[PDB]
Amino acid sequence: KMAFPSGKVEGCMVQVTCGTTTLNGLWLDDVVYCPRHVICTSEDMLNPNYEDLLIRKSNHNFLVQAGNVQLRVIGHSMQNCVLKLKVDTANPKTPKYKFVRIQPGQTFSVLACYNGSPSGVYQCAMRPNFTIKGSFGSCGSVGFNIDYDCVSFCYMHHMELPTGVHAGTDLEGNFYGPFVDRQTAQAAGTDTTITVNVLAWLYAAVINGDRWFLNRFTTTLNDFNLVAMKYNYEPLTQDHVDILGPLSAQTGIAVLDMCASLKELLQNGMNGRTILGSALLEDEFTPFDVVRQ
Amino acid sequence: RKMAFPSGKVEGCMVQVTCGTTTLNGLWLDDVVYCPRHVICTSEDMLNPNYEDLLIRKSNHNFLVQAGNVQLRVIGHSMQNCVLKLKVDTANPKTPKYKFVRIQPGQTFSVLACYNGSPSGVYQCAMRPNFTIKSCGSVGFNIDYDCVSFCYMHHMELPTGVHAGTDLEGNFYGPFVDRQTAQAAGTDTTITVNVLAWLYAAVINGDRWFLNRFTTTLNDFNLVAMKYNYEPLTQDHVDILGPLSAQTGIAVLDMCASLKELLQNGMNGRTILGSALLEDEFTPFDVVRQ
Numbered sequence A: 001k002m003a004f005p006s007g008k009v010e011g012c013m014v015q016v017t018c019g020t021t022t023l024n025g026l027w028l029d030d031v032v033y034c035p036r037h038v039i040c041t042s043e044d045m046l047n048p049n050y051e052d053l054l055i056r057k058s059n060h061n062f063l064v065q066a067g068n069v070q071l072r073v074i075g076h077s078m079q080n081c082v083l084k085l086k087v088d089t090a091n092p093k094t095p096k097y098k099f100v101r102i103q104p105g106q107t108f109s110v111l112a113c114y115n116g117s118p119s120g121v122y123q124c125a126m127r128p129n130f131t132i133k134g135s136f137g138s139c140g141s142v143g144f145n146i147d148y149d150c151v152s153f154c155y156m157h158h159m160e161l162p163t164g165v166h167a168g169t170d171l172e173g174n175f176y177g178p179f180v181d182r183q184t185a186q187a188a189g190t191d192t193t194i195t196v197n198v199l200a201w202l203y204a205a206v207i208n209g210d211r212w213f214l215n216r217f218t219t220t221l222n223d224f225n226l227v228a229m230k231y232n233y234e235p236l237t238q239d240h241v242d243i244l245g246p247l248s249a250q251t252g253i254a255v256l257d258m259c260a261s262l263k264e265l266l267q268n269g270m271n272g273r274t275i276l277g278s279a280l281l282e283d284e285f286t287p288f289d290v291v292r293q
Numbered sequence B: 001r002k003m004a005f006p007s008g009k010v011e012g013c014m015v016q017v018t019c020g021t022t023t024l025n026g027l028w029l030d031d032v033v034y035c036p037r038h039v040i041c042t043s044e045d046m047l048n049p050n051y052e053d054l055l056i057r058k059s060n061h062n063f064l065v066q067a068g069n070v071q072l073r074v075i076g077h078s079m080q081n082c083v084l085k086l087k088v089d090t091a092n093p094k095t096p097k098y099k100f101v102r103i104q105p106g107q108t109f110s111v112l113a114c115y116n117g118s119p120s121g122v123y124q125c126a127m128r129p130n131f132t133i134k135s136c137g138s139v140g141f142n143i144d145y146d147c148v149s150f151c152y153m154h155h156m157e158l159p160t161g162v163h164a165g166t167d168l169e170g171n172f173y174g175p176f177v178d179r180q181t182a183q184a185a186g187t188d189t190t191i192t193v194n195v196l197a198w199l200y201a202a203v204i205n206g207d208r209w210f211l212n213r214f215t216t217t218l219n220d221f222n223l224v225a226m227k228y229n230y231e232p233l234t235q236d237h238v239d240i241l242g243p244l245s246a247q248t249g250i251a252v253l254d255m256c257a258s259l260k261e262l263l264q265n266g267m268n269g270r271t272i273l274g275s276a277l278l279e280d281e282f283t284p285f286d287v288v289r290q
């Protein structure tokens, strides 16, 4: 399980400081994007009023540092939960880019930064409950996909949740899931295994020569869903099925048959064996991921 | 999450090298492009190759080095153990500060998987005890501060699916050869010290269910451990955990007792760091960073 090469994104990372507080920002053309809670002290983070805190601010209140050159801010607005800082210098290392909103289940790479400094990269998925099980002052660290040379920004990190997991926004600043940029207890809501991704990854195993887990049975969709939901798996919809069509077609194994395999693998375990050199099932590998590789 | 280093610094060193039939990735540093020497083998040659003979037979014009857009002029070529070095007329402006280093089995690094000179992906991995890692010319590295330590270059794909390679001075990790003869894996073992470090991570987090009162001596441990296919634990391994022992309090041998138990008893359907399985691709040093 690989992340995209992070270079294009590394050259967009900056440090943003507003008095006491410091976060990562995304520097694109002559705009720096970051989480708006950068204008909160840790105390403010209980019941912040972002309109009020923002009117009280001027361009000189924000320090933006790109390595060790300091960028002059010449304007600022807010869009939902992201702050935008207009700076006087367009970023020379700007890649071609798009902003997208992604579906739960879909995968992306995250560049974890600290104080504007890149420190690591990992692949992950938008969990069914709109969280990310990551490793994070990482706020403002962004998630993305690459399409030849087009960088799709899909995620910016904002909150660390009590249960240890991460919540965030798209690059319009709308939270993924029902969270708020506010430090009150907010329930995660129980996670579930991403069924479609598992099925795709099994198809990957077979594409690759693994057949040990196939079986003679088939199933109806409902019978599967009933069984699966009892091991905490996501319902599988007809859409999910359509997306597997490309992969069903390659290997010549029907979706519902492969669904039978999964049924049984949940029933039986691995028996010390491995699938794609993994003793655990992988659910952070989308239909599209497998198609790409 | 197990994280890779950011690959930017390395991306700016990747090139395509072509010699007749073959094409693969090279590492462009200063005015030298480094790549696996088997790039001068056709699929024929790779059976009983004579690299000395094949190399003298080559001119600078025989090598095509392609750096994204531009073609680089080669002005010299030598070989150092199993990597070829190609002198080009232009120093790479995107050269990072770097070192070439050899790593021990157990140690971790990040890999930038390229295809045809093009970066496509980056992953964390470890030098497995049998000197494998779970394309050709793709490099593995670590970063400290702004220093890139190159530690690995991919050469061979083994029948068992996994990968073998050299350091950047062209010395193979493990007893493999750059020759197309069937080559045995040599059965693996769990990297014991890394497991113990990851347990320390669990405790300095939240998970404490597996702490235990009993203590055990090195030899008794190693005897039990080696019974479930784990690596012998050395006094060196112990020293490196010293850092971690002190943070959390737990003496090394005591933590060893915990592991003893986990192997003998299982987890009882419980989990460690939200995982049912034990992790051995996280060194002492890795856990300290995180």
Ligand SMILES: CN(C)c1ccc(O)c2c1C[C@H]1C[C@H]3[C@H](N(C)C)C(O)=C(C(N)=O)C(=O)[C@@]3(O)C(O)=C1C2=O
Residues within 6 Å of the ligand: A230, A231, A232, A266, A267, A268, A269
């Ligand atoms: C894998 N194992 C041999 C079996 C065999 C038959 C079974 O009927 C079951 C298991 C494993 C366990 C695993 C786990 C599931 N697994 C990790 C996917 C799981 O996530 C949960 C859960 N509530 O989170 C279970 O209830 C669970 O206990 C379960 O429903 C199982 C279960 O019903």
